[PDB]
Ligand binder design. Sequence first.
Ligand SMILES: NS(=O)(=O)c1ccc(CCNC(=O)Cc2ccc(O)c(Cl)c2)cc1
Ligand SMILES: [Zn+2]
Length: 257
Amino acid sequence: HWGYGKHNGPEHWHKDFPIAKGERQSPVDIDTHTAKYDPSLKPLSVSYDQATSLRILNNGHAFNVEFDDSQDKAVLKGGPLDGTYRLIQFHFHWGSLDGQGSEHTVDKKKYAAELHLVHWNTKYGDFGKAVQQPDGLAVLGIFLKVGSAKPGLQKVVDVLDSIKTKGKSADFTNFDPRGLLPESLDYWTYPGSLTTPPLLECVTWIVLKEPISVSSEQVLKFRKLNFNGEGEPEELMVDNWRPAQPLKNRQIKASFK
Ligand SMILES: NS(=O)(=O)c1ccc(CCNC(=O)Cc2ccc(O)c(Cl)c2)cc1
Ligand SMILES: [Zn+2]
């Protein structure tokens, strides 16, 4: 099916998923000098105190740390968001080299990786229904640069050996996602889509200005994962990012000056 190779990559997705050339596709390049400061935006509220992580899965495209979203245990509110959005999972997109890997770019600059904390609007009952709504999801994006290690990410790095191939999963309870956040919550926001098929245009993107630093050794372990399943020829899971798409008729708002 779809992937990140030369024959099934982003350039090919539009054939099976025509929405790939849609009105509000993601990611996009964030031109910092074109974004408009919006004084009406309310403070962003990240409430992850009662977060309940459950499992980590290699789905052949990336790895997901899944949470229990049967109640409002971990939610995102405020900012450009109306209502409550529950955290369902988080994952990353990364490159084969430190100079590439992120999906969104800042003034054309590419980061080593990008973290996506996915949340769904509770007004819609379940994730499946939410992806069919223009304001169904809220994804918090965090850029990762290479430098000093991120203590809060090590627990994720150390379990990757147990889910090397597609389809593999492992118990991953008691993980605190608050350990992956930077100091500042300053952000940029715009209406977009999922960055992978089905590419549904149901996302309110909130991208933080401040990146987090991770060590070369931590990102190197991300690159040892496989796109393939067990017993199959090895294809390293690297460069699983979609490039920037046309902004078209959209405006990016900033929470800061
Ligand atoms: N890179 S990104 O923009 O943050 C991002 C985030 C999340 C997704 C997963 C979307 N999955 C489905 O749509 C399948 C589904 C369909 C019905 C369901 O009930 C359930 Cl649970 C799942 C893709 C990309
Ligand atoms: Zn993503």
